From Swiss-Prot, chains A, B:
It comes from Homo sapiens (Human). The lineage of its organism: Eukaryota, Metazoa, Chordata, Craniata, Vertebrata. Disulfide bonds join 8-37, 15-30, 20-38. One of its GO terms (biological process) is cell chemotaxis. The gene is DEFB4A. It is found in: Secreted. It comes from the Eukaryota. This is Defensin beta 4A.
């Protein structure tokens, strides 16, 4: 339920501009429309 | 340069802690300590 890039990154997760890479889990957005907060498999 | 997550993602890059993964090159930072702005060339 992440909604902003700082919360995403501080957790060790990664911000992608449109979609999470293969095997990554979508956990929220990184604020900017379309962006995704993605965590390791 | 690029030094915050929104500018990074607006450029179509990713924000990745610690390093830029395979195929990605560093084009800046995302402001938080060790965060890398990364994009495939």
């Amino acid at each position: 339920g992440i909604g902003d890039p700082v919360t995403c990154l501080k957790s060790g997760a990664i911000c992608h501009p449109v979609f999470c890479p293969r095997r990554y889990k979508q956990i929220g957005t990184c604020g900017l429309p379309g962006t995704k907060c993605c965590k390791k498999p």
